[PDB]
Amino acid sequence: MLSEQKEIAMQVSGMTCAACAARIEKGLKRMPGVTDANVNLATETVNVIYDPAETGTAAIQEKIEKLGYHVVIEGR
């Protein structure tokens, strides 16, 4: 038992409104390693609270597509 938590921050694109933006994160929470998720669309950003041993980008990118969104990584 351990499972750390970390908070990523990333950009978003390809969206209707600051509401579907919630459902992507909230749906995304339902994957493994993820525990919370919070779209900070107030400043056009998204934050995802997950375990980066169990999750990573992988499941997130997979889901992001399926949810009908795309995120952008201007930070790396």
In angstroms, the Cα distances linking 28 to 1, 6, 17, 23 are: 23, 15, 17, 8
**C-alpha span between 33 and 11 (Å, rounded):** 21
How many chain residues touch Cu ion (CB under 5 A)? 4
Query: Under the criterion CB under 5 A, does residue 17 sit at the interface with Cu ion?
Result: yes
Q: Closer CB to Cu ion, residue 37 or residue 50?
A: 37
Residue 21 or 34 having the CB closest to Cu ion: 21
Cα-based distances in Å from 42 to 14, 19, 37: 16, 11, 15
- Show the binding pattern over residues 19-48: x = contacts Cu ion (CB under 5 A), - = does not: xx----------------------------
Residues that bind Cu ion (CB under 5 A): 16-17, 19-20
